Design a protein around this nucleic acid. Structure first.
Ligand code: TTP
Ligand code: SF4
Ligand code: MG
Lengths: 1146, 261, 261, 261
DNA sequence: CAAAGTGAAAAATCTAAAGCATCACCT
DNA sequence: AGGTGATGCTTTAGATTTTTCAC
C-alpha cells in the first residue's frame, strides 16, 4: 500500500538517477525515432516506466558507434521462470495464480520444452511447462520468496487445490540479465541495428554480421599508491592517497598530491617494449580533495566505457570510496560506483575488470605468480625492475621520483595486460557467453560453462535442469555414513628415478615379440598416421613404400640384438585435450549418464541396440565405522536434547527447528567422537568398481557445446602451431625483423589456448560442483578411468620397447632407443601439402588407440525429426609427440615402495628449461632455500658425459649450498639472509575459523595479532611469513613459529616480543641466527637433497653424490647387503625341495 | 577329529610367541607320531620345524591326517588370552573350517572357549635330510637369547666360530665389533646350567642375526638349547621342550662366494 | 565453608584415575545427605554417578548445598601427585576461585596443599531412577579387567549373557569367535575371589568394548564389582567402597533396530 | 695401556641410562686418580659432573689422562649388553682406535669382548669454583620420582622458596598454583627417609620442570638426592652412588625479568 | 549468495600400538 | 637372589589438515 508506493517511488528515483548518470557520461537515450548502428558493450538490469504507468525492468543496452558516439537503449522485457505441473490440468492452476497476483504478474502461457531426465524422451515426447512473467526483478524476487516454501513442501511430500498441484518451479535462480541475453541472442562484442519507433512500439534489435572489426572503446587503467602506518594492512582511516596513474587508449595521465609529496613531479616516458607505450603528461594539483576532484572531472571528460585496475573489489575502490565518504563527495553520486551485495563494485554506466579475476581463473598461472608484478613476466614478457624493495621504499618514500615510477608501473601493466590478453579473450568469450564483461570476468569457470550450456540448451529448446543442493549425511548401501564421496581420478606413477640424458647410453631390455608384431603393424601405423592426422594425404602419397621399407629395415635390423646399451630418445607422448576428446569420442554427457531402469523405460531397447556404452569407473567412499543403528540412536538422543538458542536470551531450539546444515554439523562431530572412542578409527576408505551405461541416442547439446569450444580452442591452437612452425623456420638462420613478432604472437596464442582450455576442462569439472544443473556422479569418474586405461595401455606398449618414466594422467614420459624410427617426411603430389612430417612412436600409440579405444557406438542424428540415427567411428584421441628432449630428471622418495609423483624436470635440446613441474620453486611461498636449490641444481644435470660426472656436478651445487647453510655468514649479508630463510604461507580462511587448531601459520597469525592488533587477522587471505625458532627447546614447531615482522621494529618495542614466545625473559641477543633452528633447516635441505640426488643415485647405482647428507636406514641396509662379499642363500637352494604342496580348507 | 590336551599350558603360549615374530603364515600337520609343523618365511631364509610327540600330552586322540594352514600372526592373540598354568584343549574337526581352543582354570571354574576360522595356504614342503654335524653345542637358552639380543645391537651378520678353546659368537657393525667366547664347564653337575661341546672339525659360518633374534623367543620354553652346525649345512636351533617334544630352527648361512675364481 | 578430611587418601586418586579418561568435565554436588557427582562423557553415551558419603570422612562440616564446576582431567593429573597412603583434606569457600586439597604424610614429613583454577560452566542435574535390576553379579575387579582386555584383542562388541549356568562374555571379529564362561562358584566361599549372582530372568545384551575398557580403570577401587544389567536399561558398573558409597558407570546397550520390526 | 675392572656392573649401566637422553656425545676424561667427566648439554644449558675414584675398582691401571670421544647412545646400546651383576672390564691400548669393553659373568663361564669404535675430537673446559650454598635439602630419591614428574604435569615454571620451617616448591601453570612443602620432621629419624634441610639463608629461585624431570632418571642409581642452592648461584642436584661416586648437575638459574628493567 | 574436478607432495600435529624398565606375593 | 601379572616413559607407525602444485 503506502509502503509499496514509496518503494516504487524509490525505484523510480533509482531509475532517473541511473539515466542522469548515463546522460552525464555520454550514453544518450534513443528518444529520437530512427535507425542506429551500435556495438554492444554494457548491459545492466534497471527499471523503466512505460506508457501504461507500470514500473518494469529493462536491461539498458549500451552501444558504441564507429565515430566514437555512444548511446543507451533500455529494452523492456518481462522477467520469468518456469513452473511444472503434475498432469494436463494447466488452465486451472494458471487461473488460480492469475487471480491472486493480478497486480504483480503480466501474462501466463503454456510452454512446450524438452527435458533430459524424462523416460522415453527421444521418441518425440516433450513436457509442457508454464511461463509466469512478472514486471520487475524485485517482483521476481518477492514472488520467488513467497512461493519457494511450496517448492520444499511439495518436494518433501511423496506418497486451494489448484495451488498444490505444482511440482517444481524451474529457472528461478537465473538472473534477468542472463535471461535477456539468452532469449534474444543479444551478446556483447557484436554489431547491432537499434530501431526505435516511439514509446508505444518496443525497441527492435537485429544482429549485424557484415561488420566484423572491433571499435576502440575508452579504456581506463587506474591504480593508486597510498602511504600508511609502517607494515600494516590497508585501511583508509589513517591518511590519504598519494597518486593515481590512469591511461586513456594508450595515453597515460597522472595526478599527484603536492602538500605531502615533496618534489614537484615532472614528465617522463615509459618504454618497457615497443608494443607497450605510454605518452604521459602529469598534473600537480595541491590538495587531496582536489586530487579526487581532478580524477572526477577527467573521468567525466574522457567518459570511459571500460575501466580496469588491480584488486578493485578488495583494495583500491574501498580505499577511494572511504576517502570520498570522508571528504563528502559521494562516489555513487559522482561516477556510479557503489559496493554491491557481493563486495564487487558495479557502476550502471561502465565496465569494471579486475585483472586478478582473469589471472586467478583463466591464466593457468601458479598462485605464487598471481599478482600483477609476476603475471607481467608470464604474459607481457617483461619485468618491472625498478629498485630495491627495502631501502628506497620503506623509509625513503618521501622521494616523489621513485613514487611516480612505481605509480606509472602499476598502470601500464594492467592497461596492456587488458588490451593484449584480457580484452580480446574476454570479449571473444562474451560473444558466446550471455553475460556482461564484469560477470564474465568475475564468475567461476563452472558458471561460465553453465552459461554456455544454457545458451546451447535454449537453442536446442531444452529446459534448464534444476540447481541441485549438497545432500548432508549420505548413506552407504550397508548403512555407513559417508564423510566424502569421490571417484578414483587419474593414474599417476613415477616408474624410474634419475637423470636420463639422450647423450649418455642407457640399457634397454626389449623383448623381440614387440618388434615381431611391430613388423606387421608398420603398414597400419603409417596408413593411420597419414589418414587420420592430416585428411588431405589420404592416398596421394607418392613414396608410400619408399620410406616404409626403410622403416621396416630400421625396425628389424636391430631386432637381432634386443638387449643393448645405447643412447635414448626422451619422448613425451602427450594427448591433446584427453578429457574433452574422451567426452567427444564416447558422447559422455551428464544427461547421457543412464542406468538400467531408465534404459528399460526407453522404447529403443532393441536386442541389437548399438546404443549403450558400458565404460567403467572406480567409486571411492570414506565412511564412519559406526553403523546405521548407532546413527539412529545418536539421532534420537540428539532429538531428545535441547539446543541453545540462536537469539540472545531467546527461546530454546528443538531438533525440528534447526536447519539441516546445523544438524549435520552437530551430528558429524558427535558421531566422530563416538567413532574415535568406540572403533579406533573415524574414516574407512573403500574403493569400489562400478560400470554404468551412456545413452548414445540422447540430445547432443553437451557434446555440441564441448565440440564448439574445442574447435575454438583448436583454431587458436592451430594458429599457435603454425606460428611455432614459423619460429622453427626462422630459427637456425640469421636474425630478422619478424622473429620477435613470431615469438610474441605464439606466446599470445599459447595464452589464448590455455585460457580456452580452462573453460574446456571446466566442462569436465562442471559435473562435480555443488549447485550444478548438470551434476553427475558417474561421468567424471568414467572419463578419469578411461584416461587411466589409455595411459596404462600406453605404458604396457612402451615397456616392451623402452622404459616409461613418468606416467601422469596426461601421457607417457619415456625413453626409446636411438635406432627406433623417428620423425620422417612424407612427400605428396598435392600443392597444398607437398611434405607431411610424421613421427613413428605417436603413430604406433595412435594405432593402439584406434584398435582398442575407438568407439563404434556413436549414434548421431544426421537429420533431426526423422530417427536417422547413423553410427560412426570417430576417435579424435591423438597422442601428440613433443620433440626428443635433452634430458629428464626424476626424484625419488625417502621410504620403501614409494616414489614422488607429479614432479620432474625436462630440458629442451638447446639447454633451456622445457618443463619444471610439481616443484616448490613455482609454489607460493615455501622455503626460498628450497626454491633456490631446486632452481639452481638442475642446470648442472646437463653437465657430464656419464651418470657419475653428472651426479658429481649436481653434488657440487648441493654441497656448495649445504656449506652455505652450515657455515652461514662467512661473507653473506644479513639482508639477503633475512630474505633467504623466509617462508611465506597464506590461509584461505579467517583466524577465528582456525580456533583450537595448531599449525605454524595459525600460530604466527596469532603472534601477529597479539603483536599489532587483530585487524590483520579479521580478514581472509592473510600472508604470514615466518621462521621456526629453537630457543624454547623441547617445544614443537607450532609453538616456535615466529613472524619476521619483529626483527624490523625498534629495540624498545621488539625486546618484549623477543622474550615472550622464546620462553626466555633473560635473553639479550638480537641476531636472528641465534633464534633460528639450524637443525630444522639442515633437515629440510637434507630431505630436499635426498629426494633430488642421493636416493635416485642409489637407484641408478651411484655410490653417494653428497657425503654430508646421510641415507635412510633401508637404503643403507640395501647398500650394505650389496657391498659385502657374503651372500644370503636359501633353504630351497641348500636342502632339496620335496615339492610344492597345496593345503586347502578342511 | 584332532583333540589335544596339555596340562602345562605355558609351553604352547611360548611356542606361539616364538612363531609369531618370524612366520606370518605357517602350515601344521597331524600324524600318529604326534603334531608336527614345517614351514618357511617370506624371504626363504629360515625353515621352521616343531614336533610334539603323542605320548607327551596328557591325553591324545588321533583319527586321520589333516593339514592345517593356520595364520600364526593371529593365533597368539586368540591364545594370548590364556594363563600359563591353565589346561589347554585344542579341537580340530575333520571337515570343518573351525579350530576350537578351550582353556580350563585349575579351579575348574573359568572356562574360555574360542573358535578360529581356517583358510587355504600354498607352502613348499621341504624334506629334512639327516646330516652328521661337525659341531654340537648344548647351551642354556637364557644365555643364547642374551647372546643374540646383545649382539643384535652391533650388527646383522653373526659369525659362529667354534675352535678348540671354545665357541665364539662374533658380530660386526658401524659402531664396532663384538665377539663373545664361551668355555666348557668342568665342575658343573646341573644339566640346565652346564654347557657341553662336541667336535669333529672347527667350523666357521656366518648367519643373519635378525633371524637369530626371531629364533630366541622360545627362551623360557626350555632351559637348554642345542645348536648343531656343519660346513655348507644350515644351523639347527633345537629347543628340547622337556619330554613334550622339540622345536627346530633351520638357518641358511652366508658363505663367501669366490667371484674372482 | 568447606572442610573435609579422609585418612585413606588413595581412594580419591583411584576414582579420579578411573574418571580421567572417560569424562572431561563434571559437577561436584554437595549435600548433607550425600555428595553427588553426575557427569557425561564427550560422546554423550555414558553417564557417571560417583557418590561419597558424608560420614565416611573423618571431619566433615558443610553449611549449605553447593555446586562446583570442575574438569576431571586436570583434577586427576593434580591428584596423582599424592601417594598411596597419605591423608587427604579438602577445603573450599562458598564461591571461591580455587579448590584446596591438601595431602599430608602419615609421619607428617610431606604436607602438600594444591590450589587449582576452577572453570565456571552450566551445572546440569538429571535425576536418574535407581530402578530394580534383573541380574546382579558380585565378581572380582581384576577378573573383569582380564575379561575386557582379553576380549578386546578378538572383537569390538561384547555379547554378555547370564543364566542359571552362570555368566558368559562372548565376542566376534576378524580373528574368530570366543567366549568366557563363569559358573556359580557355590563350591567355595571366599571373601575376594567369589563370583556370586542373583537373577530373576536370564537376559543378554550387547555392549561397546572400548567403553568397558574405560570403565575398568576402577580396578583398585575394590575387589568386588557389581555389574547390574536388565532389558532396555543401561548397564551399571557399581564399585562399592567401604563406608564411602559407590561409583556407577552407566552404558547404553546396543538395542539395535530389529529386522522384523 | 690402560685397564679397569668393576665387580659392580649395574653402576655403569644406570649411569648410562640416566645420561643418554641428556647428552648425545661427550668426551670421557679418565685420569689416574679415577673417572672424571664434565659434560655440556646438547642445548647448551646444563653441565653434568661425574667423579668416580679408583677405590671401588677391582684393579685400576691408568698412566695418562686420555680423552675418549664415546657416543652415549652407542655406548648405552653396548653397555646394555653388560649384566646387572656381571664384571665389567674396559681396556685401551696405546694405538687402539677402538674401546675394548669386556664383560665377565659372575660364574666365570663367559668372556664378552666388545670393541666399540671411537672418533677423536677436542673441546675446552672451564671448571667451577667452590661457593657457600645456603639451602641443602637431603631427601629420598624415590619420592622425588613422585614429586618432580607429578609437579611437571601441572606446571613448567616452578619456584623454590626456602625457610627455617622447610622448603616449598611452588608450581605455577595453566592448572593452578601447586605447592608442596617438606619440613625436617625428625620424629622417626630413619636412615634413608631423612628429610634434612641445612638452612642458612632464604632464597627464591625459579626453574623449569621438563629439565628437572631430565635429571631425575637417576633414581635407581642412588638412594637419596641432596640438592644445594644459594642467592643467584646455579643449582647443584647431587646423587650418591653407594660409596663409588657422586653425580652432579649444574642448572643455570632462571630469573623472572621485570618489565620495568 | 556464488562456488570446475581429483592426485599428490610437504610438513606438522594427533593419536595409539608396542618395546622396555620397575612393583602386588613365596623360599 | 630366583618365579607371574600390571604400570608408566620413549619410539615409531600411520591418520588427519592445509596450501598449492600437478593432471
Ligand atoms: C590443467 C587442467 C587439466 N585438467 C584435465 C583435463 C585435461 O584433458 C587433462 C590434461 O590437460 P593438459 O594436458 O594440461 O591440457 P589438455 O590435455 O587439455 O590440452 P594440451 O595437452 O594440448 O595442452 O587434465 C583439468 O580437469 N583441469 C585443469 O585445470
Ligand atoms: S541407451 Fe538405448 S535403451 Fe537406453 S535410453 Fe538410450 S536409446 Fe533407450
Ligand atoms: Mg595433454
Amino acid at each position: 500500500g503506502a509502503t509499496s508506493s514509496v518503494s516504487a517511488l524509490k525505484r523510480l528515483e533509482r531509475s532517473q538517477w541511473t539515466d542522469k548518470m548515463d546522460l552525464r557520461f555520454g550514453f544518450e537515450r534513443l528518444k529520437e525515432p530512427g535507425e542506429k548502428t551500435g556495438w554492444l558493450i554494457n548491459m545492466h538490469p534497471t527499471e523503466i516506466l512505460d506508457e501504461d504507468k507500470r514500473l518494469g525492468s529493462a536491461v539498458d543496452y549500451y552501444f558504441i558507434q564507429d565515430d566514437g558516439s555512444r548511446f543507451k537503449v533500455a529494452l523492456p522485457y518481462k522477467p520469468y521462470f518456469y513452473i511444472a505441473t503434475r498432469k494436463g490440468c494447466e488452465r486451472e492452476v494458471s487461473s488460480f495464480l492469475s487471480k491472486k497476483f493480478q497486480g504483480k504478474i503480466a501474462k501466463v502461457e503454456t510452454v512446450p520444452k524438452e527435458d533430459l531426465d524424462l523416460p522415453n524422451h527421444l521418441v518425440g515426447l516433450k513436457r509442457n511447462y508454464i511461463r509466469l512473467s512478472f514486471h520487475t526483478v524485485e517482483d521476481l524476487v518477492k514472488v520467488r520468496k513467497e512461493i519457494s516454501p511450496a517448492v520444499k513442501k511439495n518436494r518433501e511430500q511423496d506418497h486451494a487445490d489448484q495451488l498444490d498441484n505444482i511440482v517444481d518451479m524451474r529457472e528461478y535462480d537465473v538472473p534477468y540479465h542472463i535471461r535477456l541475453s539468452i532469449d534474444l541472442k543479444i551478446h556483447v562484442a557484436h554489431w547491432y541495428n537499434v530501431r526505435y519507433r516511439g514509446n508505444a512500439f518496443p525497441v527492435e534489435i537485429t544482429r549485424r554480421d557484415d561488420l566484423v572489426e572491433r571499435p576502440d572503446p575508452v579504456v581506463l587503467a587506474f591504480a593508486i599508491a597510498t602511504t600508511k602506518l609502517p607494515l600494516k594492512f590497508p585501511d583508509a582511516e589513517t591518511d590519504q592517497i598519494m597518486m593515481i596513474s590512469y591511461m586513456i587508449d594508450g595515453q597515460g595521465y597522472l595526478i599527484t598530491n603536492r602538500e605531502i609529496v615533496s618534489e614537484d613531479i615532472e614528465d617522463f616516458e615509459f618504454t618497457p617494449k615497443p608494443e607497450y607505450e605510454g605518452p604521459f603528461c602529469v598534473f600537480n594539483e595541491p590538495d587531496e580533495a582536489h586530487l579526487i576532484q581532478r580524477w572526477f572531472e577527467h573521468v567525466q571528460e574522457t567518459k570511459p566505457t571500460i575501466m580496469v585496475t588491480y584488486n578493485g573489489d578488495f583494495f583500491d575502490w574501498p580505499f577511494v570510496e572511504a576517502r570520498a565518504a570522508v571528504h563528502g563527495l559521494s562516489m555513487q553520486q559522482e561516477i556510479g560506483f557503489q559496493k554491491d551485495s557481493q563486495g564487487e563494485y558495479k557502476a550502471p554506466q561502465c565496465i569494471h575488470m579486475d585483472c586478478l579475476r582473469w589471472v586467478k581463473r583463466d591464466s593457468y598461472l601458479p598462485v605464487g605468480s598471481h599478482n600483477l608484478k609476476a603475471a607481467a613476466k608470464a604474459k607481457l614478457g617483461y619485468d618491472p625492475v625498478e629498485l630495491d624493495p627495502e631501502d628506497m621504499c620503506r623509509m625513503a618514500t618521501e622521494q616523489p621520483q621513485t613514487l611516480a615510477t612505481y605509480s606509472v608501473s602499476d598502470a601500464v601493466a594492467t592497461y596492456y595486460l587488458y588490451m593484449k590478453y584480457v580484452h580480446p579473450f574476454i570479449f571473444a568469450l562474451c560473444t558466446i557467453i550471455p553475460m556482461e564483461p564484469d560477470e564474465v570476468l568475475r564468475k567461476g569457470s563452472g558458471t561460465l560453462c553453465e552459461a554456455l550450456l544454457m545458451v546451447q540448451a535454449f537453442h536446442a529448446n531444452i529446459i534448464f535442469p534444476n540447481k541441485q543442493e549438497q545432500e548432508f549425511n549420505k548413506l552407504t548401501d550397508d548403512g555407513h555414513v559417508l564423510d566424502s564421496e569421490t571417484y578414483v581420478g587419474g593414474h599417476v606413477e613415477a616408474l624410474e628415478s634419475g637423470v636420463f640424458r639422450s647423450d649418455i647410453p642407457c640399457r634397454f631390455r626389449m623383448n623381440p615379440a614387440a618388434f615381431d608384431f611391430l613388423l606387421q603393424r608398420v603398414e597400419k601405423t603409417l596408413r593411420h598416421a597419414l589418414e587420420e592426422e592430416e585428411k588431405v594425404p589420404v592416398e596421394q602419397v607418392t613414396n608410400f613404400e619408399e620410406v616404409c621399407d626403410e622403416i621396416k629395415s630400421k625396425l628389424a635390423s636391430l631386432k637381432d640384438v634386443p638387449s643393448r646399451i645405447e643412447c635414448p630418445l626422451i619422448y613425451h607422448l602427450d594427448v591433446g585435450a584427453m578429457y574433452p576428446n574422451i567426452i567427444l569420442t564416447n558422447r559422455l554427457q551428464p544427461s547421457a549418464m543412464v542406468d538400467e531402469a531408465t534404459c528399460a523405460a526407453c522404447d529403443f531397447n532393441k536386442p541389437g541396440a548399438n546404443c549403450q556404452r558400458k565404460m567403467a569407473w572406480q567409486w571411492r567412499g570414506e565412511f564412519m565405522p559406526a553403523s546405521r543403528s548407532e546413527y539412529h540412536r545418536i539421532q534420537h538422543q540428539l532429538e531428545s536434547e535441547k539446543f541453545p538458542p540462536l537469539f540472545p536470551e531467546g527461546p530454546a531450539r528443538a531438533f525440528h527447528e534447526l536447519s539441516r546444515e546445523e544438524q549435520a554439523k552437530y551430528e558429524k562431530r558427535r558421531l566422530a567422537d563416538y567413532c574415535r572412542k568406540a572403533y579406533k578409527k573415524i574414516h574407512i576408505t573403500k574403493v569400489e568398481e562400478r560400470l554404468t551405461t551412456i545413452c548414445q541416442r540422447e540430445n547432443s547439446f553437451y557434446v555440441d557445446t564441448v565440440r564448439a569450444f574445442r574447435d575454438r580452442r583448436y583454431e587458436f591452437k592451430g594458429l599457435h602451431k603454425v606460428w611455432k612452425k614459423k619460429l622453427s623456420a626462422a630459427v637456425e638462420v640469421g636474425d630478422a625483423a619478424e622473429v620477435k613478432r613470431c615469438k610474441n604472437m605464439e606466446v599470445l596464442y599459447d595464452s589464448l589456448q590455455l585460457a580456452h582450455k580452462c573453460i574446456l576442462n571446466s566442462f569436465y569439472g562442471y559435473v562435480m560442483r555443488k549447485g550444478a544443473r548438470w551434476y553427475s556422479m558417474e561421468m567424471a569418474g568414467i572419463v578419469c578411468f578411461t584416461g587411466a586405461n589409455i595411459i596404462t595401455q600406453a605404458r604396457e606398449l612402451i615397456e616392451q620397447i623402452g622404459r616409461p618414466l613418468e606416467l601422469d594422467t596426461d601421457g607417457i614420459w619415456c625413453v626409446l632407443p636411438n635406432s627406433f624410427p623417428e620423425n620422417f617426411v612424407f612427400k605428396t603430389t598435392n600443392v597444398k601439402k607437398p611434405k607431411v612430417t610424421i613421427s613413428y612412436p605417436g603413430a604406433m600409440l595412435n594405432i593402439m588407440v584406434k584398435e582398442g579405444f575407438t568407439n563404434d557406438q556413436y549414434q548421431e542424428l544426421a537429420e533431426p525429426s526423422s530417427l536417422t540415427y547413423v553410427t560412426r567411428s570417430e576417435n579424435s584421441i591423438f597422442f601428440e609427440v613433443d620433440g626428443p628432449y635433452l634430458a629428464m630428471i626424476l626424484p625419488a622418495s625417502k621410504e620403501e615402495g614409494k616414489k614422488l609423483k607429479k614432479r620432474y624436470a625436462v630440458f629442451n635440446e638447446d639447454g633451456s628449461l622445457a618443463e619444471l613441474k610439481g616443484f616448490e620453486v613455482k609454489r607460493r611461498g615455501e622455503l626460498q632455500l628450497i626454491k633456490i636449490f631446486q632452481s639452481s641444481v638442475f642446470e648442472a644435470f646437463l653437465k657430464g658425459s656419464t651418470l657419475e660426472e653428472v651426479y658429481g656436478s649436481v653434488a657440487k651445487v648441493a654441497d656448495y649450498w649445504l656449506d652455505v647453510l652450515y657455515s652461514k655468514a662467512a661473507n653473506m649479508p644479513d639482508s639477503e639472509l633475512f630474505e633467504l630463510i623466509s617462508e611465506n604461507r597464506s590461509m584461505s580462511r579467517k583466524l577465528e575459523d582456525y580456533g583450537e587448531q595448531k599449525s605454524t601459520s595459525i600460530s604466527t597469525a596469532k603472534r601477529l595479532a597479539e603483536f599489532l592488533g587483530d585487524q590483520m587477522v579479521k580478514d581472509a587471505g592473510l600472508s604470514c611469513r615466518y621462521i621456526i625458532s629453537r630457543k624454547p627447546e623441547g617445544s614443537p614447531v607450532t609453538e616456535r613459529a615466529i613472524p619476521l615482522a619483529i626483527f624490523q621494529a625498534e629495540p624498545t618495542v621488539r625486546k618484549h616480543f623477543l622474550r615472550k614466545w622464546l620462553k626466555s625473559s633473560s635473553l639479550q641477543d638480537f641476531d636472528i641466527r641465534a633464534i633460528l633452528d639450524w637443525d630444522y633447516y639442515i633437515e629440510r635441505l637434507g630431505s630436499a637433497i635426498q629426494k633430488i640426488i642421493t636416493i635416485p643415485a642409489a637407484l641408478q647405482q651411484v655410490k653417494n653424490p653428497v657425503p654430508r647428507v646421510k641415507h635412510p636406514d633401508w637404503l643403507h641396509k640395501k647398500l650394505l647387503e650389496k657391498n659385502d662379499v657374503y651372500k644370503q642363500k636359501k633353504i630351497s637352494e641348500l636342502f632339496t625341495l620335496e615339492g610344492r604342496r597345496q593345503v586347502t580348507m578342511a | 577329529m584332532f583333540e589335544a590336551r596339555l596340562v602345562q599350558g605355558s609351553i604352547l603360549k611360548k611356542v606361539l610367541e616364538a612363531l609369531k615374530d618370524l612366520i606370518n603364515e605357517a602350515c601344521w600337520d597331524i600324524s600318529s607320531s604326534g603334531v608336527n609343523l614345517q614351514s618357511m618365511d617370506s624371504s626363504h631364509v629360515s625353515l621352521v620345524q616343531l614336533t610334539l610327540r603323542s605320548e607327551g600330552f596328557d591325553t591324545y586322540r588321533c583319527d586321520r591326517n589333516l593339514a592345517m594352514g593356520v595364520n600364526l600372526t593371529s593365533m597368539s592373540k586368540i591364545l594370548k588370552c590364556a594363563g600359563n598354568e591353565d589346561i589347554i584343549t585344542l579341537r580340530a574337526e575333520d571337515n570343518a573350517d573351525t579350530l576350537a581352543l578351550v582353556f580350563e582354570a585349575p579351579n575348574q571354574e573359568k572356562v574360555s572357549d574360542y573358535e578360529m576360522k581356517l583358510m587355504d595356504l600354498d607352502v613348499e614342503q621341504l624334506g629334512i635330510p639327516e646330516q652328521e654335524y661337525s659341531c654340537v653345542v648344548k647351551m642354556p637358552s637364557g644365555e643364547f637369547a642374551r647372546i643374540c639380543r646383545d649382539l643384535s645391537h652391533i650388527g646383522d651378520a653373526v659369525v659362529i666360530s667354534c675352535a678348540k678353546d671354545g665357541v665364539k659368537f662374533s658380530a660386526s657393525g658401524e659402531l664396532g665389533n663384538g665377539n663373545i667366547k664361551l668355555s666348557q664347564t668342568s665342575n658343573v653337575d646341573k644339566e640346565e646350567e652346564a654347557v657341553t661341546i662336541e667336535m669333529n672339525e672347527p667350523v666357521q659360518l656366518t648367519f643373519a642375526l635378525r633371524y637369530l633374534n626371531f629364533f630366541t623367543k622360545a627362551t623360557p620354553l626350555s632351559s637348554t638349547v642345542t645348536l648343531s652346525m656343519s660346513a655348507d649345512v644350515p644351523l639347527v636351533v633345537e629347543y628340547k621342550i622337556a619330554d613334550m617334544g622339540h622345536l627346530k630352527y633351520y638357518l641358511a648361512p652366508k658363505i663367501e662366494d669366490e667371484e674372482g675364481s
